[PDB]
Write a protein that binds this DNA or RNA. Sequence first.
RNA 1: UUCUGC
Length: 148
Amino acid sequence: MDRNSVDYAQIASGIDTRTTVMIKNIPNKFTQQMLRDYIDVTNKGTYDFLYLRIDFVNKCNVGYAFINFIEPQSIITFGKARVGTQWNVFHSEKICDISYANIQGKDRLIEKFRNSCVMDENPAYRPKIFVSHGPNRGMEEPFPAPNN
RNA sequence: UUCUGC
């Protein structure tokens, strides 16, 4: 229990309007595409930012990821379906868990990474954003250019 | 718990 614990009741009532979530304990061989597909099982079209950092030296990710949901209620959908479940049906070790992210909001996450050096590694390792509203909601958006 | 030290 800390300032980043996710409480569903206070999300539903509007007490906590944070939208960015840290996904924990990801097996290090997951790719960004696999994570996107994993989330889309229950939350397709409900988020507009996804980043799973890939350590290019190894063949592994850092074990966690950050996702910005468009509406806070979508956290309840993802959490109630995935929290406590195994990342791999053959291994009890890695269990999906969530908490609030320390950087909140699509705008802040864009500003964090648009000038970052990871934007010039392979696109498979880059943060991704998606259309937040309208008929194109959920489609991938070009990341804004560096502004520094 | 994200990083042009990270």
